[PDB]
Scaffold this active site. Structure first.
Site, PDB file in Angstrom:
ATOM      1  N   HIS A 193       0.861  -1.218   0.000  1.00  0.00           N
ATOM      2  CA  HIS A 193       0.000   0.000   0.000  1.00  0.00           C
ATOM      3  C   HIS A 193       0.884   1.252   0.000  1.00  0.00           C
ATOM      4  O   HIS A 193       0.633   2.206  -0.717  1.00  0.00           O
ATOM      5  CB  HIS A 193      -0.881   0.002   1.254  1.00  0.00           C
ATOM      6  N   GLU A 194       1.918   1.259   0.802  1.00  0.00           N
ATOM      7  CA  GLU A 194       2.816   2.447   0.852  1.00  0.00           C
ATOM      8  C   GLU A 194       3.424   2.676  -0.529  1.00  0.00           C
ATOM      9  O   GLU A 194       3.556   3.797  -0.984  1.00  0.00           O
ATOM     10  CB  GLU A 194       3.938   2.208   1.866  1.00  0.00           C
ATOM     11  N   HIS A 196       1.231   4.719  -2.800  1.00  0.00           N
ATOM     12  CA  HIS A 196       1.291   6.195  -2.602  1.00  0.00           C
ATOM     13  C   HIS A 196       2.607   6.729  -3.174  1.00  0.00           C
ATOM     14  O   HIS A 196       2.647   7.773  -3.795  1.00  0.00           O
ATOM     15  CB  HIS A 196       1.204   6.514  -1.104  1.00  0.00           C
ATOM     16  N   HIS A 204      -6.220   5.811  -3.675  1.00  0.00           N
ATOM     17  CA  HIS A 204      -7.183   4.753  -3.252  1.00  0.00           C
ATOM     18  C   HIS A 204      -8.196   4.500  -4.371  1.00  0.00           C
ATOM     19  O   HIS A 204      -8.253   5.223  -5.347  1.00  0.00           O
ATOM     20  CB  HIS A 204      -7.928   5.217  -1.998  1.00  0.00           C
TER      21      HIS A 204
HETATM   22 ZN   LIG Z   1      -3.450   5.088   1.601  1.00  0.00          ZN
END
Ligand SMILES: [Zn+2]
Ligand SMILES: [Ca+2]
Ligand SMILES: [Zn+2]
Length: 169
Positions: A118-119, A122, A128
């Site tokens: 997830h990191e 970004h 998202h």
């Molecule tokens: Zn996030």
């Protein structure tokens, strides 16, 4: 506005380094989780990630606890479980993980690889999505194996392109 839109990486190849391994899991298992995540993104993109044991790396990964000289201290096991800065010089691109929570690699409380991936989303400028089959889903959910979604692949490929690589006999 030096760069148009968000500051994107000008290089098609990036490097990364782990500042330290938390006693939460052996480093042998942490490298596998982090190594596997970068390979998945590079698998569907001409981007490449190489680990460096010395020198400064484009993406710095480290573990911290409570307030760590930042304007966003962790509020106990509550709040975000980790966070990262926008891709830029100085602290930009850095990614910290909350070592206050217990990291695991199975049906336990949370999967370290799921948060690490997830990191990266970004860091790559990915946002998202409302697709439950997407890892960047706002709500955490156990999906078993971690795999990228077509929506995420098309998104990162559209910014850069398809991983074309005509191999010679
Ligand atoms: Zn996030
Ligand atoms: Ca927290
Ligand atoms: Zn931090």
């Amino acid at each position: 506005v030096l760069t148009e839109g968000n500051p994107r990486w000008e290089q098609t190849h990036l490097t990364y380094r782990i500042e330290n391994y938390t006693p939460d899991l052996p480093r042998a298992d942490v490298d596998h989780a982090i190594e596997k995540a970068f390979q998945l993104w590079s698998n569907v993109t001409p981007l490449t990630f190489t680990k460096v044991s010395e020198g400064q790396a484009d993406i710095m990964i480290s573990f911290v606890r409570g307030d760590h000289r930042d304007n966003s201290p962790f509020d106990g096991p509550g709040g975000n479980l980790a966070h990262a800065f926008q891709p830029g010089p100085g602290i930009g691109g850095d990614a910290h993980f909350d070592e206050d929570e217990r990291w695991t690699n199975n049906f336990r409380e949370y999967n370290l690889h799921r948060v690490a991936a997830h990191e990266l989303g970004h860091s790559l400028g990915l946002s998202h999505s409302t697709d439950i089959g997407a890892l960047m889903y706002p709500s955490y959910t156990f999906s078993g194996d971690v795999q990228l979604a077509q929506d995420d692949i098309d998104g990162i490929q559209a910014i850069y392109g398809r991983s074309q690589n005509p191999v010679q006999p």
